[PDB]
């Protein structure tokens, strides 16, 4: 067989059977053989096993003559940022992001924080690790501790005009992951009044694993916003490369609408820029990008496709509906911090609530949300859907699965690249009734 921890985009498995210190050391050795010359940045999240896995990675890297730059406990985006900023050969973040207690993992990047994925080196590393029975060598390179965050913090703050910010009251919910450290380092430089929820880093996760999409976790941010009259609320996953927004009513804002909102915010600073978006939900993003004078660029779903497209297009911003936001100035990488700073600046400058910034867009382009289906035969299920709709002659696009545009409504239906699932997204032109009837019709076809 093959090591199951090696996934499409990263390494993730249960400790110690799928991932352990020995495997981590072998990954470090194998990674050294894949990178161009230079040092390697290492960081880790709040999980209990994360430091020991990073230490093993470092031991393997240094046995292979790689200098290591230890940036310590951090968010994933800090590995991306420091890898690029320090002109490193590559970087590894030790993290399980949002997963359970017995699980950990790694996200690997090369120069300029370019992704290393299954077909761009990650499976090559897997195969090297799988066959490596060599004795651990001893270190031939050094490790340096670089825990200064100053350049990262300055970079984050450079996205906003601090003189235009208003003293908004913001709920912030780190979910006992790592985001609170950065909020607290940014706070002396911002006028906001923070209401801190689940703020302390705690790898035992007393308040639940850090996954703001779980309704019970969602409600903790919503309640804090409502009870404190906050302007909005922000929650992060554990490694804080995703952020999640709650308006002043406590309503969680579906991520689709943030792509168009953030695109408009960025285009005010970089006029005429290209904006990359995914194919799942599109109409609102295309319109808002064009209305702000930008050029929208359709791209297959997945961070590696989006980053590659942004690079080839010099795109200023790219966004996925699923809370991933990528910024050219940030080494084309995703940040869970830049988005809320941009939104706080937009609320401050415009005098409009976050609710009102999105309300008309949500009415104009209602969407189903991503609905997942585990079916007996995905290919037969997809064929049942396409046969049912054939007589309507939709405009079809195979950029990523099947996109079908019927005029007043459209869907995207695709197989996940990460799990054996079918994923459905539907949207309409301002018609909630059509959205529901079509979503239910497709759902019935898929399950039949
Ligand atoms: O959810 P994550 O953090 O693993 O995120 C990863 O998988 C997601 C879902 O991919 P798919 O729909 O093909 O399964 C991608 O959108 C995302 O860019 C990628 O970083
Ligand atoms: Mg994450």
Helix axes 432-447, 378-389, angle to 10 degrees: 130
CB 139 within 8 A of CB 62: yes
- Give the Cα separation of 277 and 232 in Å (integer): 25
The residue whose CB lies within 8 Å of the most ligand 1 atoms, and thus the one to mutate among 13, 278, 319, 322, is: 322
**Which atom number of ligand 1 is nearest to the Cα of residue 418?**
14
Residues of CATH 3.30.310.50 domain(s) within the chain? Answer: 366-448
Ligand lying nearest the CA atom of residue 95? 2
Distance CA 326, CA 296 (A): 14
Please name which of 3, 20, 25, 19 lies closest in space to residue 136, comparing C-alpha atoms.
25
| Tokens encoding 67 | 């200098």
Which of 225, 202, 170 lies closest to 48 in space, CA to CA?
Answer: 202
The span from the CA of 219 to the CA of 319, in Å, is 25
**From atom 12 of ligand 1, which residue's Cα is the shortest distance away?**
416
User: May I ask the CATH architecture of the domain 247-365?
Assistant: 3-Layer(aba) Sandwich (3.40)
Cβ(347)–Cβ(168) below 8 Å:
yes
Question: Measured between alpha carbons, how far is 393 from 13 in angstroms, rounded to an integer?
Answer: 44
Query: What's the gap in Å between 187 CA and the centre of ligand 1?
Result: 31
Ligand 1 mean position to 110 CA, how many Å? Answer: 19
Contact 3, 126 (CB under 8 A): yes
Residue 23 alpha carbon to ligand 2 centre in Å: 22
Pocket test for ligand 1, best of 103, 418, 425 (most atoms within 8 A of CB): 418
CB distance 6 to 123 below 8 Å: yes
For ligand 2, the distance from its centroid to the CA atom of residue 106, given in whole angstroms, is 11
* Paired sense of beta strands 317-320 and 295-298, if any: unpaired
Where in the sequence of the chain do the CATH 3.40.120.10 domains occur? 1-147, 169-246, 247-365
Q: Is the CB of residue 324 less than 8 Å from the CB of residue 277?
A: no
Q: What is the distance between the terminal CA atoms of the chain, rounded to a whole angstrom?
A: 33
Which residues, at least 6 apart from 215, have a Cβ–Cβ distance to it below 8 Å?
none
Cα torsion angle, 390, 392, 394, 400, sign: negative
Pocket test for ligand 1, best of 239, 255, 303 (most atoms within 8 A of CB): 303
Helix (H, G, I), strand (E, B), or coil: what is residue 325?
strand
Residue list, CB under 5 A from ion ligand 2: 97, 237, 239, 241
Q: Give the number of the ligand closest to the Cα of residue 75.
A: 2
Residue 440, beta-bridge partner list: none
Q: What is the dihedral of CA 254, 260, 265, 269, to 10 degrees?
A: 150
Question: Across the strands, what pairs with 79?
Answer: none
Distance between CA atoms of residues 420 and 378, nearest Å:
9
Report whether 424 contacts 445 (CB < 8 A).
no
Give the integer Cα–Cα distance in Å for 268 and 271.
6
Beta pairing class for 143-145 and 68-73: parallel
Which H or E run includes 264?
helix 256-269
* Gap between the Cα atoms of 146 and 143, Å rounded: 10
What is the SS3 assignment for 441?
helix
List, chain by chain if needed, residues with CB within 6 Å of any ligand 1 atom. Answer: 9, 97, 301-303, 320, 322, 324, 416-419, 423
Residue-level length of the chain: 448
Distance 418 CA to ligand 1 centre (A): 7
**Resolution, angstroms, 1 dp:** 1.5
> Which tokens go with 117?
């994925």
Please list the alpha-helical segments (H only) found in 2-131. 21-34, 50-63, 76-85, 122-131
CA of 440 to the centre of ligand 2 (A): 31
Protein residue with its CA nearest to atom 16 in ligand 1:
302
Closest CA to 205 of 97, 43, 63: 97
The residue ranges of DSSP E strands in 242-347, in sequence order, are 243-246, 274-277, 295-298, 317-320, 324-327, 333-334
Place domain 169-246 in its CATH homologous superfamily. Answer: Alpha-D-Glucose-1,6-Bisphosphate, subunit A, domain 3 (3.40.120.10)
Ligand 1: which residue has its CA nearest to atom 17? 302
Active site residue 97: yes
* DSSP 8-state secondary structure symbol assigned to residue 2: -
Can you tell me whether residue 162 is helix, strand or coil? helix
Could you say which ligand is closest to the alpha carbon of residue 179? Answer: 2
Structure tokens at 184: 């607290």
Tell me the sheet residues that pair with 196. Answer: 172
50, 97, 335, 368: the catalytic one is: 97
Q: Which two tokens stand for residue 442?
A: 């497709």
- 8 token code pair: 């499409």
Distance (Å, rounded) from C-alpha 31 to C-alpha 124?
9
Report the distance separating Cα 296 and Cα 312, nearest Å. Answer: 14
Specify whether domain 366-448 bears CATH 2.60.410.10: no
Pocket test for ligand 1, best of 209, 256, 324, 326 (most atoms within 8 A of CB): 324
Measured between alpha carbons, how far is 302 from 304 in angstroms, rounded to an integer? Answer: 6
Q: Reply yes or no on domain 1-147 having CATH 3.40.50.620.
A: no
Distance (angstroms) between ligand 1 centre and the Cα of 65 equals 33
């Amino acid at each position: 067989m093959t090591l199951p921890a090696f996934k499409a985009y990263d390494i993730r498995g249960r400790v110690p059977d799928e991932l352990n210190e020995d495997l981590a050391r072998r990954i470090g050795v194998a990674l050294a053989a894949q990178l161009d010359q230079g040092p390697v940045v290492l960081g880790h999240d709040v999980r209990l096993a994360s430091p020991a896995l990073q230490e093993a990675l470092s031991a393997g890297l240094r046995a292979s003559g790689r200098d290591v730059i230890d940036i310590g406990l951090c968010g994933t985006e800090e590995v991306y940022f420091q890898t690029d900023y320090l002109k490193a050969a590559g970087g590894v973040m030790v993290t399980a992001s949002h997963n359970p207690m017995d699980y950990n993992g790694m996200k690997l990047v090369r120069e300029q924080a370019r992704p290393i994925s299954s077909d761009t080196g990650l499976f090559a590393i897997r195969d090297t690790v799988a066959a490596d029975t060599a004795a651990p060598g001893e270190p031939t390179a050094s490790e340096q501790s670089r825990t200064d965050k100053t350049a990262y913090l300055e970079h984050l703050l450079s996205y906003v005009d601090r003189s235009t910010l208003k003293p908004l009251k913001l709920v912030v919910n780190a979910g006992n992951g790592g985001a609170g450290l950065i909020v607290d380092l940014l706070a002396p430089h911002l006028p906001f009044e923070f209401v801190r929820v689940f703020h302390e880093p705690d790898g035992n996760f007393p308040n639940g694993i850090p996954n703001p999409l779980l309704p019970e976790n969602r409600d903790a941010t919503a309640k804090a916003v409502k009870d404190n009259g906050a302007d909005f609320g922000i929650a992060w996953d554990g490694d804080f490369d995703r952020c999640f927004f709650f308006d002043h009513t406590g309503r969680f804002i579906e991520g689709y609408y943030l792509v168009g909102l953030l695109a408009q915010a960025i285009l005010a600073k970089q006029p005429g820029g290209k904006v990359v978006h995914d194919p799942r939900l599109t109409w609102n993003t295309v319109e808002q990008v064009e209305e702000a004078g930008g050029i929208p660029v359709l791209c297959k779903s997945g961070h590696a496709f989006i980053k590659e497209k942004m690079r080839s297009e010099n795109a200023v911003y790219g966004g996925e509906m699923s809370a991933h936001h990528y910024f050219r100035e940030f080494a084309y990488a995703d940040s869970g911090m830049i988005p809320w700073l941009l939104i706080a600046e937009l609320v401050s400058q415009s005098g409009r609530s976050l609710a009102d910034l999105v309300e008309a867009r949500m009415q104009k382009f209602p969407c189903s949300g991503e609905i997942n289906f585990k079916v007996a035969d995905a290919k037969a299920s997809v064929a049942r859907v396409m046969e049912h709709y054939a007589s309507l002659s939709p405009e079809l696009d195979y950029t990523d699965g099947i996109s079908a545009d019927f005029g007043q409504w459209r869907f995207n239906l695709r197989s996940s690249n990460t799990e054996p699932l079918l994923r459905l997204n539907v949207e309409t032109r301002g018609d909630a009734a059509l959205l529901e009837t079509r979503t239910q019709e497709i759902s019935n076809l898929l399950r039949g």
